[PDB]
RNA sequence: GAAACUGCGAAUGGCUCAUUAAAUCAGUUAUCGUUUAUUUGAUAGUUCCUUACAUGGUAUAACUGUGGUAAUUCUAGA
C-alpha cells in the first residue's frame, strides 16, 4: 500500500528472475547483470557480441512497396525501466508490440509491425500528404496545415511510444500521434531555407 | 514556441556558508525577462531545495534578447538562509520585513540634538519647567 | 602624518595580490603580524578573490566567524590577518590544507595539500640568539621564537617546524648544492641549486643559483630560501616546480 | 581616488586637410563603401597608419631576433583573422603593402550588400541599424563590425525579424488590421 | 530565567545547554521539502547525490567511492543488502561528525528503502548508534545530537508497525540510553519511544506497560529511569500543542488499570500521579473532560479491593494537580470520597480532606462538609488534630465561615484522654498567630 | 536595555600647495645611535625567614533633591 513497498515488491520479483534465468543459463553472475543494467549510463561502450554473431546464415528478406522512394525508417521497440519497472510503451494493449515507421518521397507515412522476426513488416496504418495542404500565404510564419504537402523527408519515433515526428522540404515538422496517425502538433521551422534534413 | 530554459554553470559546493554558488543561464526566446519568482520557483524544483532557500539576483539580458545570465545561490536550509543572507535580498524575497527608519539627516540630527544634551535629561525639563513657570 | 596609517589606497597596493582597479579605492590593508606589509596575503584576498568562496567582504566575515580558517594550526578571526609565505590554510568543512607558496609569475599560489604535508612548515632560522636566563633561541622568518635549538642552526638555515606542537623536527644546513627557492626580487618562485655565495663584507652577500636546465642568475642572500637536497624538495612544490621559461 | 579609465583618440586628421586628390578620394570611397563621414575614413586610416608603422620597424629589426619573430607573427596572425591579409601572403611585405579598401571591404554592411542579402550599401546599412541582421547568434546594429572569415560565412538574417522569421512591422500588421476592418464594414 | 525578550542583533552565542534545552526531536513536528520523499527513483540513491553534491568530507568520501561503484538502483540495493550496511557501520563506528551527518541520514533512508527485511541488521544499528550518542556526550555537539536522534526517530517511524509489535525488545534496546545518567539524554530517548508508545495499539501497550513497571520495580534504587518513564509518557499524551488525544485517554486508561493491579508497585503509582499532573498543567479541560470520565469510570469499576490507599493517592493527586479550574464536578468527586470511605469502614485520608477543603467549591462543602467531617472524626480519629493544623495552614478562612470550632469541639469532647499532649501541641502552635482568633475563643471539656 | 563610569578611537581619511632652491623630493645607505599601542611567537612555582585570602579599603559618576544666570554641550550646594 506504500510506493517504497511496491517498488521493493518489483524489485524483489525482477530478482527472482534474475536468479531463475541465472539457474537456466548454469543448466557473480546476477551482479554483473546488475552492473550491466546500471552499464547503460555510463558513457563507455560494453555490448560487446562482435564475435558470436552468424553472418553467413544471417536470413535476408526482401519486402517491396507500393510508394516510391522511402526516404528514412525508424522503428520503436520497448524496453523495461530499471528505476520503475512497467515497460517502455505506453497502453497495455502494446505489451511490447516492435513497431516500425516509414517516410517515402511520395508523401507517405506508414507504421508496420515487425514484432516477429520470421514473417515479414506487416502494414498497419498510413497517412499521405498531398496538394490540399498548401498553406494560402505562403509567405508568413504561419505553416500550420495538418498534413504535409511537399517531399517528406525524415521520420523519428519517441522512445515513450506515443509520438513519432516526421520533417521534410516543406519546412514543417509534424508530430503524429502512434495510433490513428493523427497529426497532434505542427511546428513550422519559421526559416525560409529552413528544410528538416535529419531528426534523431 | 516558448519554453524558457534554466541551465546552471561553475557550481561550486561552498560548504562554509553551506550553499551551492553558481551561475544561471536562461533562454526566453519569444519572451522576455523571466520573473526572479518563476527562477526560484523552478530552481527549487530542480535541486530540490526550499523557494525560500533559493536566491537570485543579478541578471542580465544580452543584446538582441532571448538569453539573460545572472547568477544564483541554494543554501541547505531556510535556516542557512535567514542566517547567511543580507537584509535586503531577506526584503526582496519576502522573509524577513523591511524597517522603518527616518532619513539620514534626521537621524544625524537628533544624533546631534541628543549629544548635546547631558544626563538622562528629566531634571533638566523639571528645572526648565518650573524656570517657565515663573 | 602624525601617527601610523590605517588605509591603502588600490593603486597603493602590492601588485601581485592581483586586485582590480575598478571595484573601489582601497585595498585590504593587511594588519600587523607574522608576515611584512609587501609579502603578505590577507585572509580576504585568499579567500574571495582566489578561492572564490566568499563574494563580499561580509561573507568572509562570516566565514572566518564561522571559525572555520585556521591558519597554522590555529584559528584566526581577523579578516585582513597578513598569511605570509609558506603557510599551512586549513579549510576543515571543505577538507583542504594550502600551502601558500608563490608560483613563477610572481604571484602567490594556492597549494593543495593532503594532512600529513599540513602537519609541519618550513621556516628560515634568520637570527640565532641567547636569551634571558640563558637560554639560546631562534627567529625564524614568521616571528617564531623558538627557544633551546640544535646547536648547529646557524643564520639563514632552514628549519622544518611541527606545527601542533611549535617545535623543531630537523634542519638543513646553508651549503653550496643544496635546493634554494628565491621569494623576493625579479626571480620570485624560480627554484634553483645553489652554487656560489659570493660574500662580501658590509654589503650584500650574492648568491649564484643553477636550475634545472642549466640556467645561472644571481640573487641576495635576503631573497634566497634553501628548500631541500639535490632532488629533494621537503615540501611538494607547485605545478612547473618553479621553472622560467619562454 | 578611483583609478582612471583610460581612453585614446581613434582618429586623426592627416597633414594636409585640402587637397584635390585626397578630397576625390575620400569621395571615391565613401560613395562606393556607403560610408558617412570623414571621421570614418580618418579612423581606417589612422588603423592602417598603426599598423604598417609597426611592420615597418620589424622590418628594419634584424631577421631571426626574437622581437621580430614574436611581434610579427602576432601581428601576421590578428591580420589573417581579420581576413585582410591571405593565407599565402604570411609576410611583413604583404603587411607593408596592404590598404584601405581592403579594410573596409572587411567592414560588414560590405559584406551584407556583398552577401547578397541587400540590394545596396545604403540599403545594407539600414537592414544592419534596423536590427534585422545577426552574425551567427548575436543581433548586431553596428555597421562597422570587421566581420572574421567564419563569421563572413555565418551572417544571415536574425529571427527576432519579420524578415528572416518571426511576425511582421508594425506597417504591415497594422495594415492588416485597416483591411479586415474595411472587409468587416 | 532562560533567553526571553530577544535582542536586535542576528548572532547569538547560544551555548551548549542552550542549544540542548531548545532542542526538540519530532521531524513531523518540524516539515520542510524533504529530497527522499520529494524525489523516488530509490531513497537511497536520492539522498545520497544530494550528499555528494553537499558533503566535502574525507571519510563520506571514501564511503561515496564504495557504495557510489555499488548502488545505483534498488535491486543493487536488495542484493548487496550486508556490504553497503557493514560499510555504512564501519564509518559511523569511525565518529566524524563532518561525516556524521550525511551517513546518519542515509541509514535512515536505507531503512526506508529495506523496509521488513531491516529486521536483522537492526539491532546493532541501534547499538552503533548508542555508542554514537556517548560518544557525543563525550564531544559536546548539538548538531550530533539533533542527528542522531533524528535517525532514531526515522527509524521507529518507518518500522512502525513491527517495533510496535515487538515493542518490549526496543525498550530493551534503548533502556541503556533511557535510564542514561543526562538529562537530555533520557529527554530524547524517550521522546522516541513515545512517538512508538503513542503508535502501539492497547493489547501490546498493556503488555509493555506491565513489562516496563516489573523493570521500575527491578530499578527500584534507580530514579532517572522513573523520570525518563515519566517524560516518556507524557510525551506520549500531549503531543499536540495543547490538547491530548484520544490515544492519550486510552493510555490513560490502560496505565490506570495496570497500576491499580496488586501487583504494581506503588512507586509506579506515583509514576502515574506525576504524569496525570503533567497532563492536568498542560491541557485545557475541554480537550481533559473525557479522561476524567475514563479515569472516574475505572475507579467505580476497580474501588473494591486492598488497592484502596492506591485510589486514594491518585485521587489526591487528582484533587490537587492544579485547583477547580480542571475539575469539572466535584459532586462526582464527593460520590469517589463517599464510596471510598465506606470501602475503609490515613495520612493520605488527611491530605486528601485538607486538600479539598483548601481546593474544592464551595457550592459542594456546602453539602458535603458535614460528612467530610463526620469521616475525619470517625475514621482518622487520632490523626484529626494533625489535619486540622494542615487545613487552618492551608486555608484557615474556608473553614472559619464553615464550623471549624463546632467540630473541633465536638472532637474535644469526644476524645481527649489519649492525646492531651497532642492537644496541647495544637494550641502551642495556635496561640501566635493573629489570625486564629476563633481558635483563641473555642471552649473547652 | 536608556543614562553614566571604564576601555579604545578621535594622530587614519578628506582638502590645498601658502611657505621652502641641497631645503622638500628621486634613487641609494645607516641605526654597532634610538622609541614603538597593536598584531604574532615565546616568557615569570623564587619553600622558609619571630608580634583576613572562602578574597582588604575609600570614594565619586549617572540618579533623588535644593538652586543660580538673558544666554552656551555653564554648572554649585546636599
Redesign the interface.
Known sequence: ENPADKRRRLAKQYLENLKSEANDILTDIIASRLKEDVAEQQGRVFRYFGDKLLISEAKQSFTRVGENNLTCISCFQPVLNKYTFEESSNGDKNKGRLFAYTVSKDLQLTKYDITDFSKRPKKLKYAKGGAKYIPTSKHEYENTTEGHYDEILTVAASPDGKYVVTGGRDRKLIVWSTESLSPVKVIPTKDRRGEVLSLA | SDAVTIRTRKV?S????ARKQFVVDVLHPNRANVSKDELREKLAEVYKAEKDAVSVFGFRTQFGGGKSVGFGLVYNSVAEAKK?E?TYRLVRYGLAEKVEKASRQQRKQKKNRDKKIFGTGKRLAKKVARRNAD | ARGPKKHL???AAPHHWLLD??SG?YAPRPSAGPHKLRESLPLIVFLRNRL???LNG??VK??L??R?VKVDGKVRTDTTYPAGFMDVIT?????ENFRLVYDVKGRFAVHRITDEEASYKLGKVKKVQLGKKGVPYVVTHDGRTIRYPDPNIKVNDTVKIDLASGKITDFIKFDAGKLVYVTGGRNLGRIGTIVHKERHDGGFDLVHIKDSLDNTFVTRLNNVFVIGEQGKPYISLPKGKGIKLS | ???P?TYSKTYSTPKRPYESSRLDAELKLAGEFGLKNKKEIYRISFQLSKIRRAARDLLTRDEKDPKRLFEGNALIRRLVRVGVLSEDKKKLDYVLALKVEDFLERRLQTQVYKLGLAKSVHHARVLITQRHIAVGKQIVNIPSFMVRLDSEKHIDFAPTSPFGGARPGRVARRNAARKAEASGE | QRQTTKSSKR?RYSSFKARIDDLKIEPARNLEKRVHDYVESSHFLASFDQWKEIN???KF?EFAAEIEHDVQTLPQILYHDKKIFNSLVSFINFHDE?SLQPLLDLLAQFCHDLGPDFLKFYEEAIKTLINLLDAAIEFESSNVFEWGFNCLAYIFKYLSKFLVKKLVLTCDLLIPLLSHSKEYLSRFSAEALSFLVRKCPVSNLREFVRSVFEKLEGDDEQTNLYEGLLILFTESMTSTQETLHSKAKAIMSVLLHEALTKSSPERSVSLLSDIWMNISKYASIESLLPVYEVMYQDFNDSLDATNIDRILKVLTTIVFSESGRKIPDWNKITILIERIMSQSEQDKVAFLFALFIRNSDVKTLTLFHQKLFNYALTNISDCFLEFFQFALRLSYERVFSFNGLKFLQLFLKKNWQSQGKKIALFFLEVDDKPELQKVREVNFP
Open positions: 561550486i561552498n560548504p562554509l556558508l547567511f543580507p | 589606497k588600490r593603486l582597479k575598478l579605492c572564490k568562496y566568499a561580509r561573507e562570516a566565514i566567524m564561522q572555520h579549510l576543515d568543512a571543505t577538507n | 581616488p578611483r583609478a579609465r | 548572532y566535502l568530507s574525507a568520501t563532518f
